[PDB]
């Protein structure tokens, strides 16, 4: 709301103003009135009141009040409207401004973007936090310096980074689309004050740098090139780096789509001055025990469970409660889990030392205590987690935990039935009104530290002290290496892999397998692994990312993985995988680690990455498990991102107003007609304060797209009960008409869009896989961004229609498509339809998304079919049902086969259908061969809190659909088998009479 308990304040309202002479003066006001207006009218009536004798001029005073976030806020921007003040209650205090005004204004801006006041970090006792807050700045500082290493070109590369592919090589069927390896390309320029546009159609080589394109235009060659830079017409996308032209994403897809590239010439100096040169200010916050080593303590690990404050359990329904406990390294227990005795629900008290089969010096660095309080209800009985909590056995300074501590536990995530949650975050619940478990660790007359690397190598040599690699072996290493990240290795394979650990360096990508063969509960073997990891060859980023999931918690392993990313991960692929990399931060034991340093640095040296870095972090701020971590991270970013914070604040402000509006629609107007809801909406949007917020800002879907004036007459609510908003902005680029005149975005508030965000990411990666192999199977991964708790944006796809919209007899679809393309362009459309169909058919089967129907499926004018509304994937409705089978979400009815068969009535038997069949077959195998990437991507998401992605068991569905336990030949037959079943025999097998 815009005042506590209230969604919108009335046109007028009274305000208790509290003068510095202790007076209290009411004041009639307007909701859009500004502070300057308020102060003026306030001091007016102040003269009506006692003792205005001691009142100075307004110029000497400022306004202060309380916000919704319970912070005492000082309003320096006295042009800000009363309804945008975010007052808790409608009162204002007027006092003498004091202290660094700059820091205070920045602080409140960061806190606004961050969704929480920075001052809440100040009063955090925990040292790891304050250590993070200070240390992380070193990276921020380091970042802004890389941004000036070559000013002013360094400045522009940050704000307008080249949007390029990873490699300048073109796949064969992309090069084949050029004219003799050349591309037709249109350039425009400003003429006079009237600034009219004019064509200069070029036809140059694809491998050309922007310099050449800049050169040719004028038709002193090396004279005036560096006077100008190229811009994309419609976007704020630029060409600042010496990349081959065809390596830019926009050019590449133009080539791909058969679209003609339209660039705009612009004075290099004209942009370089639009750059703020934004500087970065250092914020204000800028025992003689002789510590023992961990390896010196000859003791078995034991932990004491004392008591729990309470659990929420009906005393009638549950027999006993107990504490379940485990020592975990990642997701694997290091020894047997140990329960406490069973006690009544009415008195949760234990006071028993639990003993574990682990010798203290054998505790690995990443070891964790995982616990939960469990309820228990012939001899058969059921066991259920009531609340859970995880604890790092070592803190961020390598100190072993000791003595009494309290642990406030967490709610069990929906659908989780494991008695323990080793994948959950560690540390206590910040909410103290919650079940609290007391425990005691041994204290060892001292402070216990995990050994330094020096001592670890020391022990590594000793361990080992106290051969031709045969061909037989050499092939088994290959075989093992080809297993997918969830194909468990056998004990024979572990023993073998370990025995040949030294030879394994020859074949570096087997590192995940080798790390799984290490006895992690033995310092001997771990010490030896550390040495190997120290000098290990780097591996491809796609494989390095495997090592960042919850199954490789060890900092050395993670360290190597991060280091692989520093060298080999391009910004293009970084953008592609950003969702998972951010999600994986939840697996990190500590606030300070190499990955967060690497990510923050990238976010601060590339505005495009920083943009989505911000949003993915922000979207989860409501989630109290990562609130602190992400909040801290966000403060760092916002402090050092320079001018973009202002751009980001307009995005946050615009979204918050869309949130307030849809809130009002959903609860305060749930039983009003759509027709009256729209008119309400319109009246609100019409207001000056709204038009200021909702116009002239950057699209969070794509920061290169500027959203200008709202076309309010064409904005609509939609049919769903969530009341999604169909919004329409003017594209205010002066070259607008050459790309798109208007931007349409669906604002949805009420549904989880993360699943769709994920599904669409995957689809893009799939299309990418196929393209790099000569399979032009064109997909439509439209924009979808989660920006908060069940709040997000969806890009509208223009010139598309549902299948039903066509239908409303099995020949109509082909007939429609025919009319829309009638002529020599008919075969570039039955084509596009067929390819599209193959990709989405294979993609939806592998992923197991929700059942397709005539609203689920859409077609563009030019033939391209795509899907929308994925919601559920990996067959999540496997919970209600009980079947093991793998659905085929997208069955091709005669309607589609007829379109594929260009009209033919024998559509299951034709050169066309069988040609279509081979496309799917090739697409399927293509993905199966890149199974690792997809399994790894899914594995990084297990902590996300997505109901469909809680356990490794959930990811097992694509091992099934990709038949990874099977042979490649069997995998194809399996696919065919699945199609024939769904298409009721009507999917012609290799059993055909020719």
């Amino acid at each position: 709301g815009e005042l506590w308990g209230i969604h919108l304040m009335p046109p007028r309202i009274l305000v208790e103003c509290l003068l510095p002479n202790g007076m209290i003066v009411t004041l009639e006001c307007l909701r859009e009135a500004t502070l300057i207006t308020i102060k003026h009218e306030l001091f007016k009536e102040a003269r009506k009141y006692p003792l205005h004798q001691l009142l100075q001029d307004e110029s000497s005073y400022i306004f202060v009040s309380v916000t919704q976030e319970a912070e005492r806020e000082e309003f320096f921007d006295e042009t800000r409207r009363l309804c945008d003040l975010r007052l808790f209650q409608p009162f204002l205090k007027v006092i003498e401004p004091v202290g660094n005004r700059e820091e205070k204004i920045l602080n409140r801006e960061i806190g606004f973007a961050i969704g929480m006041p920075v001052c809440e970090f100040d009063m955090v006792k925990d040292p790891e936090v304050q250590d993070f807050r200070r240390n992380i700045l070193n990276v921020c500082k380091e970042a802004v310096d890389l941004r000036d290493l070559n000013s002013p070109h360094s400045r522009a590369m940050y704000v307008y980074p080249p949007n390029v592919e990873s490699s300048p090589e073109l796949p064969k069927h992309i090069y084949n689309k050029l004219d003799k390896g050349q591309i037709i390309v249109v350039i425009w320029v400003i003429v006079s004050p009237n600034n009219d546009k004019q064509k200069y159609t070029l036809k140059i080589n694809h491998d050309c740098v922007p310099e050449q394109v800049i050169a040719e235009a004028i038709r002193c060659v090396l004279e005036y090139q560096g006077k100008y830079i190229l811009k994309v017409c419609g976007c704020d996308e630029y060409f600042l780096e010496k990349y081959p032209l065809s390596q830019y994403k926009y050019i590449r897809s133009c080539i791909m789509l058969g679209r003609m590239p339209n660039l705009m010439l612009m004075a290099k100096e004209s942009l370089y001055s639009q750059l703020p040169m934004d500087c970065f200010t250092m914020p204000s916050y800028s025992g003689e025990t002789s510590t023992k080593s961990l390896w010196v303590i000859n003791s078995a690990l034991r932990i004491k469970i004392l008591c729990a404050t309470y659990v929420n359990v009906n005393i009638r329904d549950i027999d006993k409660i107990y504490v379940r406990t485990g020592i975990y390294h990642g997701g694997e227990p290091l020894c047997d889990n140990v329960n406490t005795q069973r006690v009544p629900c009415s008195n949760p008290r234990w006071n028993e030392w639990l003993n574990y089969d682990i010798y203290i010096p054998d505790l690995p660095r990443a070891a964790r205590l995982c616990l939960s309080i469990c309820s228990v209800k012939g001899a058969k009985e059921e066991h259920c987690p009531l609340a859970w909590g995880n604890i790092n056995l070592f803190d961020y300074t390598d100190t072993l935990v000791s003595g009494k501590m309290a642990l406030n536990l967490w709610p069990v995530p929906h659908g989780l039935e494991d008695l323990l949650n080793p994948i959950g975050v560690t540390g206590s619940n910040p909410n103290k009104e919650t079940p609290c478990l007391e425990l005691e660790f041994d204290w060892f007359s001292s402070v216990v530290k995990f050994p330094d690397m020096s001592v670890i190598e020391e022990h590594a040599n000793w361990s080992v002290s106290r051969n031709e690699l045969r061909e037989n072996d050499k092939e088994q290493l290959k075989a093992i290496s080809t297993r997918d990240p969830l194909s468990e290795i056998t004990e024979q394979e572990k023993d073998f892999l370990w025995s040949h650990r030294h030879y394994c360096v020859t074949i570096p990508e087997i590192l995940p397998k080798l790390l799984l063969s290490v006895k992690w509960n033995s310092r001997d073997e771990v010490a030896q692994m550390y040495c190997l990891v120290k000098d290990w060859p780097p591996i491809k980023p796609e494989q390095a990312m495997e090592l960042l999931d919850c199954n490789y918690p060890d900092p050395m392993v993670r360290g190597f993985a991060v280091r692989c990313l520093e060298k080999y991960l391009t910004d293009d692929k970084l953008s592609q995988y950003l969702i998972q990399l951010v999600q994986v931060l939840k697996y990190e034991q500590y606030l300070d680690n190499l990955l967060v340093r690497f990510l923050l640095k990238k976010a601060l040296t590339n505005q495009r990455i920083g943009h989505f870095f911000f949003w993915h972090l922000k979207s989860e701020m409501h989630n109290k498990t990562v609130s602190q971590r992400f909040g801290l991270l966000l403060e760092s970013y916002c402090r050092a991102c320079g001018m973009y914070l202002k751009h980001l604040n307009r995005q946050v402000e615009a979204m918050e107003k869309l949130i307030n509006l849809t809130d009002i629609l959903k609860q305060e107007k749930k039983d009003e007609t759509q027709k009256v809801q729209m008119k309400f909406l319109v009246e609100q949007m019409r207001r000056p304060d709204f038009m200021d917020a909702l116009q002239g800002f950057l699209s969070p879907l794509n920061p290169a797209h500027q959203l200008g004036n709202l076309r309010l007459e064409e904005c609509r609510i939609m049919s769903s009960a969530k009341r999604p908003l169909w919004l329409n902005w003017e594209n205010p680029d002066i070259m607008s008409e050459l790309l798109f005149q208007n931007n349409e975005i669906i604002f949805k508030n009420g549904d989880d869009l993360r699943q769709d965000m994920l599904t669409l990411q995957i689809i893009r990666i799939m299309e990418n896989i196929w393209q790099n192999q000569g399979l032009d199977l064109r997909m439509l991964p439209y924009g979808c961004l989660s920006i908060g708790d069940c709040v997000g944006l969806i890009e509208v796809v223009r010139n598309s229609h549902t299948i039903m919209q066509i239908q409303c007899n099995s020949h109509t679809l082909h007939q429609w498509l025919k009319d829309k393309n009638k002529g020599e362009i008919y075969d570039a459309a039955i084509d596009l339809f067929t390819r599209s169909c193959a990709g989405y058919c294979v993609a939806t089967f592998i992923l197991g998304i929700g059942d397709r129907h005539n609203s689920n499926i859409m077609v563009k004018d030019d033939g391209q079919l795509f899907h929308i509304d994925f919601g559920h994937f990996l067959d999540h409705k496997k919970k209600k049902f009980g079947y093991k089978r793998e659905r085929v979400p997208f069955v091709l009815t005669q309607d589609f086969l007829i379109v594929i068969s260009k009209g033919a009535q024998e559509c299951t038997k034709t050169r066309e259908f069988e040609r279509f069949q081979e496309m799917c077959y090739k697409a399927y195998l293509a993905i199966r061969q890149h199974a690792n990437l997809f399994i790894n991507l899914f594995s990084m998401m297990l902590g996300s809190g997505m109901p469909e992605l809680q356990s490794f068991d959930d990811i097992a569905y694509i091992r099934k659909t990709l038949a990874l336990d099977k042979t490649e030949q069997e995998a194809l037959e399996y696919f065919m088998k699945q199609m024939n079943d769904a298409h009721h025999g009507g999917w012609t097998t290799k059993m055909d009479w020719i």
């Binding site: 202790g22 004990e491 093991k884 091992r959």
Partner: protein, 277 residues
């Protein structure tokens, strides 16, 4: 007696089931729990043995060459039933001293026989349909409770920061009491001597309105606290109900699944199963 029985009749033999199914069967089980499945067709080996040891699942592959079976060369067992029966009576320390455990607890494919012996395919396929609807009814019961749970947890969070915002506000209005009190011990004293009761009157009127405003805001905060306690109790109550549904839910699913496996043997038309669902 034992060793002559066919592998196909052996209880711990499940044939072609996946590592995943094996995983659910083995979760949270005691050491020595085990079962044998067909090896994956892409690797070498005929069968994989999976056992519990120290909280983990151990996968040990069983190979075959020329009539003989084993974990490694030399292969010295005559049949799989023989191999297994050996280690049901001898610790696997013999094969690997690092693996001290024997194969104590089989996982029967005739285990469903204990919870159901009921014989008619349709007497079972109707109980399944009944347990299933019992299950989905409780499923929805628990889901509705979960949306109350989240909605309530959030509103409590809203209320809590509102309490904090009320306290900051009360703090200010009381500092405005100090600002008013302090700025008057002399500027009212000077109208006391001279008896300017004229003006004293409307300072008191102003001071009173300050006290009056303080008082009403403390009422509001007080009313919010009672609403907070009320809703916190609603929340804890909600959490109790879910905790009574949880055990019944798992069992209902466990029971339904058992009946799904029993109907998977006897190979029921999977289109029948769908109508039974």
């Amino acid at each position: 007696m034992n060793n002559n029985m066919s592998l196909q009749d052996a209880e711990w033999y499940w044939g072609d089931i996946s590592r995943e199914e094996v995983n659910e069967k083995l979760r949270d089980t005691a050491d020595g729990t085990f079962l044998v499945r067909d090896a994956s067709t892409k690797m070498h080996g005929d069968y994989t043995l999976t056992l519990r040891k120290g909280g983990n699942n151990k996968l040990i592959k069983i190979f075959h060459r020329d009539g003989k079976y084993g974990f490694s060369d030399p292969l010295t067992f005559s049949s799989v039933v023989e191999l297994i029966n050996h280690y049901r009576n001898e610790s696997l320390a013999q094969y690997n001293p690092k693996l001290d455990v024997k194969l104590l607890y089989p996982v029967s494919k005739y285990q469903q026989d204990q919870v159901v012996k009921e014989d008619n395919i349709e007497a079972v396929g109707k109980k399944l349909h009944e347990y299933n609807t019992q299950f989905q009814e409780k499923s929805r019961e628990y889901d509705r409770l979960y949306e109350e749970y989240t909605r309530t947890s959030q509103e409590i969070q809203m209320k809590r920061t509102a309490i904090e915002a009320f306290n900051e506000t009360i703090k200010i209005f009381e500092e405005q009491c100090q600002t008013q009190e302090r700025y008057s011990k002399e500027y009212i004293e000077k109208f006391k001597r001279e008896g300017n009761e004229k003006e004293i009157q409307r300072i008191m009127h102003n001071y009173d309105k300050l006290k009056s405003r303080i008082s009403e805001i403390i009422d509001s905060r007080r009313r919010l606290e009672e609403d907070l306690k009320k809703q916190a109790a609603e929340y804890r109550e909600i959490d109790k109900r879910m905790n009574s549904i949880k055990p019944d839910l798992i069992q209902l699913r466990k029971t339904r699944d058992q009946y799904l496996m029993w109907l998977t043997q006897k190979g029921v038309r999977q289109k029948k199963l769908n109508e039974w669902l």
